[PDB]
Design a protein around this ligand. Structure first.
Ligand SMILES: Nc1ncnc2c1ncn2[C@@H]1O[C@H](COP(=O)(O)OP(=O)(O)OP(=O)(O)O)[C@@H](O)[C@H]1O
Ligand SMILES: Nc1ncnc2c1ncn2[C@@H]1O[C@H](COP(=O)(O)OP(=O)(O)O)[C@@H](O)[C@H]1O
Ligand SMILES: Nc1ncnc2c1ncn2[C@@H]1O[C@H](COP(=O)(O)OP(=O)(O)O)[C@@H](O)[C@H]1O
Lengths: 370, 370, 75, 370
């Protein structure tokens, strides 16, 4: 009996260890109302969380507590974890030990303060923080190979060979789902359809998930988009109003492969995956090309795998065979790994206890992280 | 054609026209179409069903005001064509549009359909030699005569902050919010009804804009002025009747700096300025704080510069020099910039010829913009 | 001044500028290392009359004809 | 030749240029090509798409930085051509390349293709009378005015140790390691992200280099200073914001002494020096240990001399006299050596003439360099 709780910037995936898929999946947001001095009606919650805030988007100002895999407002994150254990999962945190997930190369204060809350506020019996990328490999039953776990908050590239990780080869890029969502708003505003508010940004994320797809040749796709209106698809908003996004459909996910569009002055998700493999030892490169995994929900774009293969193959040597690993459950790839890890009898020892936390302090986490 | 170019500012509230030779705009009239309020069947009433600028101001109470441009976007194009036709009337300028070339001043990050249709009208309806769409912010710097400078241009329709350093505008650091002078006029009408004076009519909305422009001071501390008993300064209406404004005077334009009070999800005028500087690169931040320029009519509020300086200082880093350099001609700054730009021999290269638009296509106007 | 006197909607009796108040090697002094003063004029004089023999010079990774020592002798 | 020969110390971090005979290099500017990343909209902005040296330093925030040479190997030659062109331009020495001979200063044990292309550019693109390529270490000894000494030259790009006894330099005892000042700045950036301050931008990476030079001390005992709670020393960024560096201050420069931290299997700077002496013949070991000369900018770290003297003493034999001598101008020591060598009449014989290069080709340069 143990709890796996993925603390993703976009969506918080929580559930019991051993189960196939996560029990409760809700958007990680806190909804505070745009209140005036006028008195409010009955059935009023001071701050709404998750699926409740997703229902009452109209009035509530949606504030994401985790920004680029860094917890900015801890009071907000506490209210999400309270919604996770007590309401969503229907379980006491004192009974079950809780596994959390942190992105690699995050600030040290993040892991420090995270565990402090779990030990003091919720009074958990044991707490282990893990790298999202390390878990994602277990999903595919692969010990060897690199992963390109692109989330809503961040995208990170962690090469692991024969159950041994290369820490110095790890590269983090701040370009992620939320930056693409923010980019899609700007180009939709250029077409005509203006989306400004926090509630409207959530509707633009629903537009992104459904329509947007990765093009094989961007320049070739822009030529077809100009000539014919075949790529132009219609989407119905919450309001009866319908919109035809056009070429901006495949223009949004292009930003992943060339950040110049967003204006970050950084390497693309294809180029960073190559650079990470080159930073590793020369011998093991072979297996990393052969076992390139794509994880998170930012790798569920239709035809990212085809475009990824093409771009890596061009950069990589001709003799090498480049196979991209795209399992059907990419969105729940971080959690399903956690469920496999927590269930294993070997992992029982690796848990950090309250007694261990009390004596040493919150600094113990940095030793027993990975 | 060598004959003098005609600058025209597309201000949502007030459109400012004139020749490039003039130091100031000779002809500047309100941007609204005036039709008779009662649907005219009979003779001896207001004939034509069109009253623009000074003719409208004379017979204002009889007519019904309808603004053609909202939030820096043209809603009714038929109305805007009549307005631009009145610019080339016997009343203002008194010239052929076919002879003189034109310069438009569209707000930043507007819809591309707005720019395309604006060009189509000025090339097809009027037989213009050449047209050039420009950004309102870039012009404001030419007027003042400095290359580096952030331009907080608070218009009637839209308030936007564009950072430009050494003649280089960062397009990602641009910030645009719809809460502008027109919204302040709308919110003042609500507070005037809370004082007990209704301005229900579209004509009666114009005198609320006059009340705002005459008497509305921005308090340095809003909470202290609320507790203090007001003088209740009397304003005289067109009919002759007096109205005591009282606390509505100062707590109306406050909604610029704090738009959450009414319940509008926006950043605020102090916030968009700071955010635009913070979004830009770290090296430039100090110079961009050291060079801020106020543009448009919604900066002329009494004690605006006093409040903004205080609200920017607390958000901005400690011990940083913040100079908010307002010109004396803030309202007419955007046009004077165009008048200088138009006069230069470089402008001859920048604009798009009528034959160029026929051959090249639609993109011609967009690609030459920058 | 007379230009802005003509126009109606102009700021009168207002300050133009709103501004804030104007606010007014450790290794090279180490014990471990011995600090030398570089005098190129002195150095130039010491090497002044020193020459090199560039005849039969080959520093390259050429195997032929045993070992070589570049810069044979002066004068 | 009557015209003085120009000394150019082609350093990875800073390229130092000047005329032979001069006591100090008159014109020393940072080695990078700055291109504007933001768009030009206004007229009168900064002219050219290439900014090099002091103009690039002033307008750093505007530009995207790109180092042409990495680890003493010219990666992009087009860029290296533009910086050498800028040395001869009006801003620096302001003379024709055809009239003055050149003295280039490359690092030891660099690729042969680098020396070949370096010559090709300096003879074809610039029609120079004569070029001599020399080692950095050999010059550093002429500057101090000593015939016997080992030269530990820790530069920005590469750190190397060359044992030189009575004029002769031992080519098999040369020790070179890629880990250097620029890897310390790269390793500092990684630890600053762990502390929770991000510097993703190429312009922001120059601020990390500024933080390194100002606030980073090498602790005499590494394991001792790790455990003890450190005083969190605040540093002021260009914008004004304060960062607490904390443990990253002293952990960052330790990379030079322990290359295992970044994860490269190479010798430490302390191991490089002793290995270079131990590789030399038995008789000269005592004289080389007595005569150690530190060079390059990366030796200027606070407590470098103290730590190195501690580390060398443990690896070196018992009861041997270890005197580490530092010239006050460590940074400019390499160039001053070049000026003294260039001023001698013996340098005339050492040169490769144009005709000599044109006849034999690449071989002539390889024959006469060490
Ligand atoms: N099918 C899809 N196609 C395209 N984009 C998607 C799709 N599903 C989700 N996204 C986008 O990618 C993000 C995926 O978030 P996800 O559910 O993987 O959680 P997360 O916060 O990224 O967690 P983690 O970092 O642990 O992977 C969403 O926020 C959304 O913006
Ligand atoms: N003297 C003034 N005091 C206060 N508000 C003013 C004043 N003059 C104009 N305004 C406000 O500013 C608006 C004018 O905006 P304007 O500068 O013409 O915008 P644009 O830059 O788009 O042309 C008016 O409609 C009014 O709301
Ligand atoms: N005061 C300082 N403290 C620490 N490191 C420094 C200091 N000054 C310069 N450096 C480092 O030394 C570098 C300069 O290298 P330099 O000696 O000019 O190279 P080269 O010897 O290859 O010509 C800088 O880029 C920086 O990384």
């Amino acid at each position: 009996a143990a709890l796996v709780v993925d603390n993703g910037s976009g969506m918080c995936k929580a559930g019991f260890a051993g189960d196939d898929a996560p029990r409760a999946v809700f958007p990680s947001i806190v909804g505070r109302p745009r209140h005036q001095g006028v008195m409010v009606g009955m059935g009023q919650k001071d701050s709404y969380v998750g699926d409740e805030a997703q229902s009452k988007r109209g009035i509530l100002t949606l504030k994401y507590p985790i920004e680029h895999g860094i917890v900015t407002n801890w009071d907000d994150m506490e209210k999400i974890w309270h919604h996770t254990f007590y309401n969503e999962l229907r379980v006491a945190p004192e009974e079950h030990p809780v596994l959390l997930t942190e992105a690699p190369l995050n600030p040290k204060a993040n892991r420090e303060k995270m565990t402090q809350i779990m030990f003091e506020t919720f009074n958990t019996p044991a707490m282990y923080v893990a790298i999202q990328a390390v878990l994602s490999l277990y999903a595919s039953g692969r010990t060897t190979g690199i992963v390109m776990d692109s989330g809503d908050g961040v995208t990170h590239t962690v090469p692991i060979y024969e159950g041994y990780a290369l820490p110095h080869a790890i590269l983090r890029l701040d370009l992620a789902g939320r930056d693409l969502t923010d980019y899609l708003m700007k180009i939709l505003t250029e077409r005509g359809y203006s989306f400004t508010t926090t509630a409207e940004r959530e509707i633009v994320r629903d537009i992104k998930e459904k329509l947007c797809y990765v093009a094989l040749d961007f320049e070739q796709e822009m030529a077809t988009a100009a000539s014919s209106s075949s790529l132009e698809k219609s989407y119905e908003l919450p309001d009866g109003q319908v919109i035809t996004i056009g070429n901006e459909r495949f223009r949004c996910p292009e930003a992943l492969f060339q950040p110049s569009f967003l204006g970050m002055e950084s390497c693309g998700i294809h180029e960073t995956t190559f650079n990470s493999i080159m930073k590793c030892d020369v011998d093991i490169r072979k297996d990393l090309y052969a076992n390139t995994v794509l994880s998170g929900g930012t790798t569920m774009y239709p035809g990212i795998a085809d475009r990824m293969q093409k771009e890596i193959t061009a950069l990589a040597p001709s003799t090498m065979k480049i196979k991209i690993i795209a399992p059907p459950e990419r969105k729940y790839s971080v959690w399903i790994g956690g469920s496999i890890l927590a269930s294993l009898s070997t992992f029982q020892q690796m848990w950090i206890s309250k007694q261990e936390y009390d004596e040493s302090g919150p600094s113990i986490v940095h030793r027993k992280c990975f | 054609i060598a004959n003098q170019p005609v600058v025209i500012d597309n201000g949502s509230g007030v459109i400012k026209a004139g020749f490039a030779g003039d130091q100031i705009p000779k002809y500047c009239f309100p941007n609204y179409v005036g039709r008779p309020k009662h649907v005219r069947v009979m003779a001896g009433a207001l004939e034509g069903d069109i009253f623009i600028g000074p003719k409208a101001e004379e017979h204002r109470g009889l007519l019904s005001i309808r603004y053609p441009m909202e939030h820096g976007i043209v809603k009714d194009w038929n109305d805007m064509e009549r307005i631009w036709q009145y610019v080339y009337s016997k009343d203002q300028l008194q010239t052929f549009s076919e002879e003189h070339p034109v310069l438009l001043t569209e707000a930043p990050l507007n819809p591309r359909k707005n720019r395309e249709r604006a060009a189509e009208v000025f090339f097809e309806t009027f037989n213009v030699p050449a047209l050039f769409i420009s950004m309102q912010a870039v012009l404001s710097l030419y007027a003042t005569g400095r290359t580096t400078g952030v331009v907080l241009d608070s218009g009637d329709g839209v308030t936007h902050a564009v950072p430009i350093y050494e003649g280089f505008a960062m397009p990602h650091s641009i910030m645009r919010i719809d809460i502008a002078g027109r919204d302040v006029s709308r919110f003042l009408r609500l507070y005037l009804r809370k004082e007990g004076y209704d301005f229900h009519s579209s004509s009666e909305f114009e005198i609320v804009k006059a009340i705002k422009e005459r008497a509305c001071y921005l308090s340095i501390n809003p909470q202290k002025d609320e507790t203090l008993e007001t003088e209740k300064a009397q304003y005289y209406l067109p009919d002759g009747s007096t109205i005591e404004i009282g606390p509505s005077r100062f707590r109306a334009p406050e909604l610029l700096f704090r738009p959450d009070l009414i319940g509008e999800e926006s950043e605020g005028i102090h916030e968009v300025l700071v955010f635009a500087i913070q979004k830009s690169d770290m090296d430039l931040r100090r110079t961009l704080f050291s060079n801020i320029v106020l543009s448009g009519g919604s900066t002329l509020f009494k004690g605006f510069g006093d409040r903004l300086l205080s609200e920017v200082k607390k958000l901005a880093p400690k011990d940083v020099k913040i100079r908010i350099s307002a010109p004396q001609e803030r309202l007419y700054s955007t046009w004077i910039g165009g008048s200088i730009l138009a006069s230069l021999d470089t402008f001859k290269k920048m604009w798009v010829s009528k034959k160029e638009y026929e051959e090249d296509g639609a993109r011609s106007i967009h690609r030459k913009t920058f | 001044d007379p230009k802005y006197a003509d126009l109606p909607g102009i700021a009168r009796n207002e300050p133009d500028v709103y501004e804030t108040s104007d606010l007014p090697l450790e290794e090279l002094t180490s014990t471990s290392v011995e600090h030398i003063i570089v005098n190129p004029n002195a150095a130039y004089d010491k090497f002044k009359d020193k020459r090199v023999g560039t005849k039969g010079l080959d520093f390259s990774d050429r195997i032929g004809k045993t070992k070589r020592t570049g810069y044979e002798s002066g004068e």
